[PDB]
């Protein structure tokens, strides 16, 4: 009779995948991670 | 008689995939991750 | 009769993956990690 | 004047994605990965 | 004048993703990884 | 004039991702890793 996150629970558990494979000179950017903030995610800025 | 996230639960659990493969000079950007904020996601800015 | 994060729990447990493979001169950036802050994520700035 | 995998190169770099989301009792199987061998891919056997 | 894997190179660099999200009793299997061998991939056997 | 794995090189560098998120009783299996051998990949056997 268990209660797995019932009621008013905010259950957020997804799978987020980011993959970039490359053969050659790589100067750009590959951006992943959750980044839950304003202007989040490391970049150039 | 279990309750898997019943009631008023906000159950959000999807699979989000981002893939970029490339042969050659890569200078652009591949953008993944959840990025749940204003101007979220690392970029150039 | 256990209660796994029921009630008003904020249960956030996803899988976030960032992968970048590359053959050659790599000068750009690959950005992962959670980065839960303003301008979060190490970059160039 | 670069040569990105020219000549007799076997250049194989695709993006293969497998996603299965489900709400409820999950007893079956979701099968991904490359599995480049005879009877490859973990299963029941 | 660089040679990124030219000639008779076997250049194999793809992105293979396997994702399975589930709400509830999970008894089955989610199978990923490369598994480059006979009967490869962990299963039940 | 660099030679990044040219000639008869076997260049194998992909990104293989396996993700399984689950809310509830988890008794099954999630199978990842490369597992480059016969009957490879930890399972039940």
Curated annotation (Swiss-Prot), chains A, B, C, D, E, F:
Compartments reported by the entry: Nucleus; Cytoplasm
Record note on what altering residue 25 to A does: No nuclear import nor export
Gly residues bias locations: 26-44
Region described as Nuclear targeting sequence (M9): 18-45
The organism's place on the tree of life at top rank: Eukaryota
PTM annotation (Omega-N-methylarginine): residues: 34
Post-translational modification: Sumoylated.
Sites bearing Phosphoserine, chain numbering: 35
Assembly behavior: Identified in the spliceosome C complex. Identified in a IGF2BP1-dependent mRNP granule complex containing untranslated mRNAs. Interacts with SEPT6. Interacts with C9orf72. Interacts with KHDRBS1. Interacts with UBQLN2. Interacts with PPIA/CYPA. Interacts (via the RGG-box) with the HOXB-AS3 peptide; the interaction inhibits binding of HNRNPA1 to the intronic sequences flanking exon 9 of the PKM gene, preventing inclusion of exon 9 and promoting inclusion of exon 10 which suppresses formation of the PKM M2 isoform and promotes production of the M1 isoform. (Microbial infection) Interacts with HCV NS5B and with the 5'-UTR and 3'-UTR of HCV RNA.
Function description: Involved in the packaging of pre-mRNA into hnRNP particles, transport of poly(A) mRNA from the nucleus to the cytoplasm and modulation of splice site selection. Plays a role in the splicing of pyruvate kinase PKM by binding repressively to sequences flanking PKM exon 9, inhibiting exon 9 inclusion and resulting in exon 10 inclusion and production of the PKM M2 isoform. Binds to the IRES and thereby inhibits the translation of the apoptosis protease activating factor APAF1. May bind to specific miRNA hairpins. (Microbial infection) May play a role in HCV RNA replication.
UniProt disease link: Inclusion body myopathy with early-onset Paget disease with or without frontotemporal dementia 3: An autosomal dominant disease characterized by disabling muscle weakness clinically resembling to limb girdle muscular dystrophy, osteolytic bone lesions consistent with Paget disease, and premature frontotemporal dementia. Clinical features show incomplete penetrance. Amyotrophic lateral sclerosis 20: A neurodegenerative disorder affecting upper motor neurons in the brain and lower motor neurons in the brain stem and spinal cord, resulting in fatal paralysis. Sensory abnormalities are absent. The pathologic hallmarks of the disease include pallor of the corticospinal tract due to loss of motor neurons, presence of ubiquitin-positive inclusions within surviving motor neurons, and deposition of pathologic aggregates. The etiology of amyotrophic lateral sclerosis is likely to be multifactorial, involving both genetic and environmental factors.
Protein name: Heterogeneous nuclear ribonucleoprotein A1
Part of the intact protein present: 303 to 347 of 372
